[PDB]
Amino acid sequence: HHEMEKEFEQIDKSGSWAAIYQDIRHEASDFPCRVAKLPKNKNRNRYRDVSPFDHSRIKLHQEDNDYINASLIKMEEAQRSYILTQGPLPNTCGHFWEMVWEQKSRGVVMLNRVMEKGSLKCAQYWPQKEEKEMIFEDTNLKLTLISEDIKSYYTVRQLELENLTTQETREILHFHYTTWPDFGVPESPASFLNFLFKVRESGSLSPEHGPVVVHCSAGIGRSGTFCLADTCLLLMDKRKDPSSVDIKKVLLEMRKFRMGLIQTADQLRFSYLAVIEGAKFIM
Template sequence: MTNETQDAVSNVETEYLQINSTETWPLIYQHIRHESCNFEYTLNESKKLQNKILNRYRDVAPYDHTRVILKKGPCDYINANLIKVERAHRQYILTQGPLPSTAGHFWLMVWEQNSKAILMLNKVIEKNQVKCHQYWPLESSSSHTMMFPDVNLKVEFVSKTQSSDYTTNTLKLTDMETMESRNILHFHYTTWPDFGVPQSPTAFLRFLVDVRSSGALDINVGPPIVHCSAGIGRSGTFCLVDTCLVLIEENGLNSVNVREVLLEMRQSRMGLIQTPDQLRFSYAAIIEGAKGLPSNNNLEIDSITNHYDVVNNEILSNSSLEDDDEPPPLPPPRGDSLTRSMMADLTPSPITENENGIGPPNKPLPMEPPTSTDLIKNTVTTITNNTHDNNSHDMIILDSTKSDDTNSNTNSNSESSPSDKSEIRHRHQHEKKERIAAQVREMKRRQKESEDWKKFKRSLFMPVTIGIGTVLIGGGMIAIYGYFYSRG
């Protein structure tokens, strides 16, 4: 590695440590999302009636100008985009996890694009929900063959290699018209949680080395098919890390600005990288990889990896503590907010397959969160109406338990005696006071973070508005606290 490349890594590492020290990953990520909102690309094909049922999530659709067009079969539509980064000599096809009704389309795309490999970054079932159809034959199945008559293709299991974090399957894809066959590599990363990140960059980099060594990313073969459930979060993370490492390896110091590369890739498919944690992980993996991609058998862990592990463990630990008092959460929709414990769940349920594997629910998922002004305005209206209707002087606060608590209170009060009602009311008032105290502590922490942020490098991002309002009604205080992270 050249000195210039080492300097480039040092700059990225410095940026990573600065953002970490000020805990401003959400604000960096919000700035990226804000920039992406300026894109004016159309989604017309995805909105056609016959194509709507072919999308796993209604808020994740392929841009028209980069969508993959199928050449034969029942239709030309598939929820997939071709992403090209010319200066890195890289191209990828990012797509959703197939539905039962689109599995044939998926394999037709693999065939027509002459792809050598499929990179699957999710499990079939996550958080008790089907996130992807079982579209390939398993070694353990009675028949090692799957037929897709709608596209006249056959897929056969050939062999499997098991690693600690991923499985590599070799599959044989055959065109039943011409009887031509090809071997397809199926890299299945099994330890990457939905909306999350791997525990450490090291295992991910081993996976990347294995994929690169197979030739699946070479320019003399078709683009690899990369997918998770929606084809934007984990898939975008993989492509960002790989592309930035290529740029650093080939061009050195002035070749890579991680956020610029991500924005460039977002012009080909919407919403790439869904959470601030995925962005933070991307930086850490780029830093480690640029110091020398690890071999499969020998990986030296340095200070950034150790630092990442410590911070990641703290985040996981704090997250579990915050959730101790809440019921087990449902799997979030693709556009779910990162601040589940700080605001009510304002989004519909995620789209899942019905028993036939086809069709989204009646309610669409919003692609973008409401603005701070809109949310506060709506909240004030709702609280005011509730106050007039119920003559309530209780303190109302936005948190993830509000909806559940309200429902449980209503059911309990309708069946309880007056003494029980009084006891329940006192208990809930006590619980609300505890929540309020926690919210106040959080507000103070956020205020301090905001003050620290003013001292941060102005060139890193545009500031995000933090709104705090207090309203007095009939002796009771209504505290409204809004702090908005982004949703991808």
């Protein structure tokens, strides 16, 4: 039994977020990342210090080079899986969609804007115009924009992904959270939570499909907040006593699948806030 809310207020009052966060960084498990560090894969990694562990990395179905900086996070008790990956690089957009195709994912969750504070955070990996398809010649995939629905805090697009070898097509939902602040974290978790609920209602997180693909720039900070909040809320609804859910233990378990999830104390505090408010709204 825990008291997340009381604990939260106490950490706030004592100014202990950095200490709490350091405990998590120190207790986090480590696993080999040999494939990610191979010389041939250097240009497939956005950041030299953010790599997928070998045990949980997603493998592309190709003989030449099966590497992509993406990780499968499987939450057993919560019964949910997610693929967390970095924002596509100019040379890995074809790989990204190859992964979406091979894993039979129904949705992609994007938590960054292509350009933020004058810095390119990821490539423009989907077409912005319906009449201008995108062809990924290296992985034999074509992507066409079917619809775009822009809302205040996020945009939902439907994309048609076509396998150029077989002509089979699939529709992918792209849920783009477009308002994460340039500095810090959102002051209120309301919009983030509403976005999470839209993704849940979309079927993108359902077991009838391959795992949702979630990304931000590195695929560990904002992406970690999204999956941590979702899994914690899933556990609070499942268990007999929602107060028994330990957010720190849940984060440590997710970190066994991808390193560095939650990159700052502010993101850890925001994750707590989102789970606390999301729990209330749900119950």
